[PDB]
Design a protein around this motif. Sequence first.
Motif, PDB file in Angstrom:
ATOM      1  N   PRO A   1      14.926  -0.813   4.800  1.00  0.00           N
ATOM      2  CA  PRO A   1      14.020  -1.947   5.013  1.00  0.00           C
ATOM      3  C   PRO A   1      12.551  -1.731   4.666  1.00  0.00           C
ATOM      4  CG  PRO A   1      14.689  -0.995   7.090  1.00  0.00           C
ATOM      5  CD  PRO A   1      15.630  -0.463   6.044  1.00  0.00           C
ATOM      6  N   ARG A   2      12.100  -0.481   4.654  1.00  0.00           N
ATOM      7  CA  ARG A   2      10.707  -0.201   4.317  1.00  0.00           C
ATOM      8  C   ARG A   2      10.436  -0.293   2.823  1.00  0.00           C
ATOM      9  NH1 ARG A   2       6.864   0.411   3.890  1.00  0.00           N
ATOM     10  NH2 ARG A   2       5.678   2.259   4.558  1.00  0.00           N
ATOM     11  N   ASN A   3      11.498  -0.375   2.025  1.00  0.00           N
ATOM     12  CA  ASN A   3      11.345  -0.486   0.581  1.00  0.00           C
ATOM     13  C   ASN A   3      11.384  -1.948   0.139  1.00  0.00           C
ATOM     14  OD1 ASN A   3      11.071   2.296   0.143  1.00  0.00           O
ATOM     15  ND2 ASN A   3      13.296   2.590   0.055  1.00  0.00           N
ATOM     16  N   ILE A   4      10.971  -2.194  -1.102  1.00  0.00           N
ATOM     17  CA  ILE A   4      10.876  -3.544  -1.649  1.00  0.00           C
ATOM     18  C   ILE A   4      12.089  -4.021  -2.446  1.00  0.00           C
ATOM     19  CG2 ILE A   4       9.315  -5.108  -2.837  1.00  0.00           C
ATOM     20  CD1 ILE A   4       7.300  -2.749  -2.924  1.00  0.00           C
TER      21      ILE A   4
ATOM     22  N   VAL B   1      10.718  10.553  -6.591  1.00  0.00           N
ATOM     23  CA  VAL B   1       9.672   9.539  -6.647  1.00  0.00           C
ATOM     24  C   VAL B   1       9.630   8.875  -8.021  1.00  0.00           C
ATOM     25  CG1 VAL B   1       7.200   9.092  -6.426  1.00  0.00           C
ATOM     26  CG2 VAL B   1       8.322  10.724  -4.898  1.00  0.00           C
ATOM     27  N   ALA B   2       9.787   9.670  -9.076  1.00  0.00           N
ATOM     28  CA  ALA B   2       9.781   9.132 -10.432  1.00  0.00           C
ATOM     29  C   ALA B   2      10.926   8.136 -10.612  1.00  0.00           C
ATOM     30  CB  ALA B   2       9.899  10.263 -11.447  1.00  0.00           C
ATOM     31  N   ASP B   3      12.051   8.381  -9.944  1.00  0.00           N
ATOM     32  CA  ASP B   3      13.185   7.465 -10.045  1.00  0.00           C
ATOM     33  C   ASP B   3      12.779   6.078  -9.550  1.00  0.00           C
ATOM     34  OD1 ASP B   3      14.820   9.446 -11.048  1.00  0.00           O
ATOM     35  OD2 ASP B   3      15.896   9.794  -9.169  1.00  0.00           O
ATOM     36  N   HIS B   4      12.004   6.038  -8.473  1.00  0.00           N
ATOM     37  CA  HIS B   4      11.553   4.763  -7.938  1.00  0.00           C
ATOM     38  C   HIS B   4      10.593   4.081  -8.901  1.00  0.00           C
ATOM     39  CE1 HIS B   4      13.230   4.650  -3.814  1.00  0.00           C
ATOM     40  NE2 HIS B   4      13.399   5.936  -4.067  1.00  0.00           N
ATOM     41  N   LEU B   5       9.635   4.834  -9.432  1.00  0.00           N
ATOM     42  CA  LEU B   5       8.677   4.258 -10.364  1.00  0.00           C
ATOM     43  C   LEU B   5       9.348   3.724 -11.624  1.00  0.00           C
ATOM     44  CD1 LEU B   5       5.533   6.539 -10.056  1.00  0.00           C
ATOM     45  CD2 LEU B   5       5.729   4.088  -9.554  1.00  0.00           C
TER      46      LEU B   5
ATOM     47  N   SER C   1       0.788  -1.232   0.000  1.00  0.00           N
ATOM     48  CA  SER C   1       0.000   0.000   0.000  1.00  0.00           C
ATOM     49  C   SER C   1       0.819   1.281   0.000  1.00  0.00           C
ATOM     50  CB  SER C   1      -0.970   0.007   1.181  1.00  0.00           C
ATOM     51  OG  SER C   1      -0.269   0.122   2.402  1.00  0.00           O
ATOM     52  N   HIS C   2       2.034   1.215   0.534  1.00  0.00           N
ATOM     53  CA  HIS C   2       2.925   2.368   0.544  1.00  0.00           C
ATOM     54  C   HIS C   2       4.381   1.959   0.783  1.00  0.00           C
ATOM     55  CE1 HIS C   2       1.576   1.873   4.704  1.00  0.00           C
ATOM     56  NE2 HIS C   2       2.405   2.794   5.165  1.00  0.00           N
ATOM     57  N   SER C   3       5.032   1.528  -0.296  1.00  0.00           N
ATOM     58  CA  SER C   3       6.432   1.113  -0.262  1.00  0.00           C
ATOM     59  C   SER C   3       7.092   1.458  -1.586  1.00  0.00           C
ATOM     60  CB  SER C   3       6.559  -0.397  -0.032  1.00  0.00           C
ATOM     61  OG  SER C   3       6.105  -0.770   1.256  1.00  0.00           O
ATOM     62  N   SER C   4       8.380   1.771  -1.534  1.00  0.00           N
ATOM     63  CA  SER C   4       9.106   2.114  -2.743  1.00  0.00           C
ATOM     64  C   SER C   4      10.198   1.087  -3.046  1.00  0.00           C
ATOM     65  CB  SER C   4       9.640   3.540  -2.620  1.00  0.00           C
ATOM     66  OG  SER C   4       8.534   4.423  -2.444  1.00  0.00           O
ATOM     67  N   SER C   5      11.212   1.466  -3.821  1.00  0.00           N
ATOM     68  CA  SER C   5      12.260   0.524  -4.230  1.00  0.00           C
ATOM     69  C   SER C   5      13.539   0.472  -3.400  1.00  0.00           C
ATOM     70  CB  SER C   5      12.636   0.794  -5.689  1.00  0.00           C
ATOM     71  OG  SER C   5      13.728  -0.014  -6.086  1.00  0.00           O
ATOM     72  N   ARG C   6      13.877  -0.721  -2.915  1.00  0.00           N
ATOM     73  CA  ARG C   6      15.079  -0.902  -2.104  1.00  0.00           C
ATOM     74  C   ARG C   6      16.340  -0.800  -2.968  1.00  0.00           C
ATOM     75  NH1 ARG C   6      15.278  -5.665   2.490  1.00  0.00           N
ATOM     76  NH2 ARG C   6      13.197  -4.775   2.856  1.00  0.00           N
ATOM     77  N   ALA C   7      16.231  -1.180  -4.238  1.00  0.00           N
ATOM     78  CA  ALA C   7      17.368  -1.100  -5.149  1.00  0.00           C
ATOM     79  C   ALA C   7      17.735   0.364  -5.382  1.00  0.00           C
ATOM     80  CB  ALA C   7      17.029  -1.773  -6.476  1.00  0.00           C
TER      81      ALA C   7
ATOM     82  N   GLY D   1      -0.090  -9.122  -8.217  1.00  0.00           N
ATOM     83  CA  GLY D   1      -0.250  -7.971  -7.343  1.00  0.00           C
ATOM     84  C   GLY D   1       0.357  -6.662  -7.811  1.00  0.00           C
ATOM     85  N   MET D   2       0.482  -5.712  -6.890  1.00  0.00           N
ATOM     86  CA  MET D   2       1.037  -4.415  -7.247  1.00  0.00           C
ATOM     87  C   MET D   2       1.713  -3.700  -6.088  1.00  0.00           C
ATOM     88  SD  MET D   2      -2.592  -2.425  -7.691  1.00  0.00           S
ATOM     89  CE  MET D   2      -2.029  -0.736  -7.704  1.00  0.00           C
ATOM     90  N   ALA D   3       2.735  -2.921  -6.428  1.00  0.00           N
ATOM     91  CA  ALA D   3       3.492  -2.147  -5.455  1.00  0.00           C
ATOM     92  C   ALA D   3       3.099  -0.686  -5.636  1.00  0.00           C
ATOM     93  CB  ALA D   3       4.990  -2.330  -5.695  1.00  0.00           C
ATOM     94  N   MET D   4       2.529  -0.099  -4.591  1.00  0.00           N
ATOM     95  CA  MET D   4       2.098   1.290  -4.649  1.00  0.00           C
ATOM     96  C   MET D   4       3.180   2.172  -4.037  1.00  0.00           C
ATOM     97  SD  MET D   4      -1.893   0.478  -3.703  1.00  0.00           S
ATOM     98  CE  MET D   4      -2.699   1.741  -4.725  1.00  0.00           C
ATOM     99  N   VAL D   5       3.903   2.863  -4.912  1.00  0.00           N
ATOM    100  CA  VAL D   5       5.014   3.720  -4.508  1.00  0.00           C
ATOM    101  C   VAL D   5       4.620   4.783  -3.494  1.00  0.00           C
ATOM    102  CG1 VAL D   5       4.725   5.485  -6.301  1.00  0.00           C
ATOM    103  CG2 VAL D   5       7.011   4.995  -5.380  1.00  0.00           C
ATOM    104  N   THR D   6       5.484   5.020  -2.513  1.00  0.00           N
ATOM    105  CA  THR D   6       5.180   6.036  -1.520  1.00  0.00           C
ATOM    106  C   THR D   6       6.131   7.225  -1.640  1.00  0.00           C
ATOM    107  OG1 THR D   6       4.521   6.371   0.788  1.00  0.00           O
ATOM    108  CG2 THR D   6       6.602   5.198   0.405  1.00  0.00           C
ATOM    109  N   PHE D   7       5.745   8.340  -1.030  1.00  0.00           N
ATOM    110  CA  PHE D   7       6.509   9.579  -1.120  1.00  0.00           C
ATOM    111  C   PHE D   7       7.409   9.919   0.063  1.00  0.00           C
ATOM    112  CE2 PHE D   7       2.609  11.320  -3.691  1.00  0.00           C
ATOM    113  CZ  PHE D   7       2.852  10.384  -4.685  1.00  0.00           C
ATOM    114  N   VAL D   8       7.311   9.153   1.147  1.00  0.00           N
ATOM    115  CA  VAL D   8       8.106   9.411   2.350  1.00  0.00           C
ATOM    116  C   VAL D   8       9.565   9.721   2.007  1.00  0.00           C
ATOM    117  CG1 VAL D   8       8.785   8.544   4.609  1.00  0.00           C
ATOM    118  CG2 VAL D   8       6.600   7.831   3.601  1.00  0.00           C
ATOM    119  N   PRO D   9       9.992  10.977   2.207  1.00  0.00           N
ATOM    120  CA  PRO D   9      11.371  11.370   1.898  1.00  0.00           C
ATOM    121  C   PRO D   9      12.462  10.487   2.497  1.00  0.00           C
ATOM    122  CG  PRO D   9      10.047  13.304   2.169  1.00  0.00           C
ATOM    123  CD  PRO D   9       9.207  12.140   2.660  1.00  0.00           C
ATOM    124  N   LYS D  10      12.333  10.150   3.776  1.00  0.00           N
ATOM    125  CA  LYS D  10      13.344   9.328   4.427  1.00  0.00           C
ATOM    126  C   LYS D  10      13.385   7.894   3.904  1.00  0.00           C
ATOM    127  CE  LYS D  10      10.707   7.836   8.502  1.00  0.00           C
ATOM    128  NZ  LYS D  10      10.794   7.639   9.978  1.00  0.00           N
ATOM    129  N   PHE D  11      12.554   7.592   2.905  1.00  0.00           N
ATOM    130  CA  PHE D  11      12.548   6.265   2.288  1.00  0.00           C
ATOM    131  C   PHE D  11      12.970   6.341   0.824  1.00  0.00           C
ATOM    132  CE2 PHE D  11       8.815   4.741   5.147  1.00  0.00           C
ATOM    133  CZ  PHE D  11       9.692   4.621   6.218  1.00  0.00           C
TER     134      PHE D  11
END
Length: 391
Positions: free
Chosen positions: A222-225, A299-303, A211-217, A238-248
């Motif tokens: 740890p909060r990223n995928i 955020v676009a970098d993660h997407l 519901s709210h996770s971004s890319s670990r790569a 399924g699907m990964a819904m990118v989040t905006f949390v700056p510290k992530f």
Amino acid sequence: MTSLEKARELLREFPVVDGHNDLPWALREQVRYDLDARDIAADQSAHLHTDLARLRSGGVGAQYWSVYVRSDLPGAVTATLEQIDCVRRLIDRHPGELRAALTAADMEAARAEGRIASLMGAEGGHSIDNSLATLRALYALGVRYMTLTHNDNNAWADSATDEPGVGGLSAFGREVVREMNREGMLVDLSHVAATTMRDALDTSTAPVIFSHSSSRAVCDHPRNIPDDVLERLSANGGMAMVTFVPKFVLQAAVDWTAEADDNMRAHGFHHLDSSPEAMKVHAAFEERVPRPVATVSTVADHLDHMREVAGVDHLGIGGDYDGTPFTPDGLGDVSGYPNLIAELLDRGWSQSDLAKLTWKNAVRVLDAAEDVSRGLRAARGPSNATIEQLD
Ligand SMILES: C[C@H](N)P(=O)(O)C[C@H](CC(=O)O)C(=O)O
Ligand SMILES: [Zn+2]
Ligand SMILES: [Zn+2]
């Protein structure tokens, strides 16, 4: 027209289905649910990331309202019911702008009439108090997804921000996933440990979500995928819904927060200590090291990476508005989505790619959960298992 103008046009046809907004918790903490004090029919920019006018300006067509409650306080079930009540009250107070949605069909019905489909998602397995019947009660009340853990491990699942516990999902943890599959409740893997992610993907017979996770790569936190987990989404559906949390999402922010936490411990304080003395220490740190600011590009970098690994059919957006204090520039509140869509257009994302990201993937996934549920409900009855029996 400009990319921003085009973005708004695209969102009018296929709006954003946001996976996680904590307005309920914000209302609980700020005014203890005194809705008149934070009427979202009025401008709440001074206190919240969210209100009706900004949601419309942002192109949000469906919202999974989080019914999150703290896992470090007792009475989680009661608190979850109060969070659900808050969502119900908001829907009842604003019939012209909001429409309750329990199914994928409800989401489309809402879009057809121009109302924001309002769904609910529980954030943390502690919300069911190790009770499968309670899980079923939450579903009956309208909850359509449940993050298996929040920041801490629970008895049957490991959190990404805690030490290893049961090693992912315990036997009862797998039973919870099976019951969610039967009920038609989406398994949300945000917050959980990578081990838990893999165990959930092994067990689930229905598409799962983040519901709210971004890319670990892209940003190792740890909060990223992890990429290996993203790769399994196409098969899982399924699907990964990118989040905006700056510290992530912003590397500089991840590093800054790590250094801020170390500094706190250097002064003998737990990094989460919020006492006046602890705040003095943190203030001093920010004084010599300003907080880095993320942008829409971050955020676009993660997407971009998530699209490459998971596939365009397995992406969504989960802003985490009103659940986190800081936001990327350009995404300051719920009215910012068009800026992100504009950036993606500039990066070459197609109109159909974007319609999937905002609307189509989310509807497909909820429909799939319903489909899997129909089969399981016809095949067997609900589980009466206890955590004592299985664990
Ligand atoms: C506490 C909120 N329900 P949340 O939605 O769990 C926000 C955090 C980030 C933060 O503390 O700012 C996260 O999602 O990992
Ligand atoms: Zn969260
Ligand atoms: Zn939350």
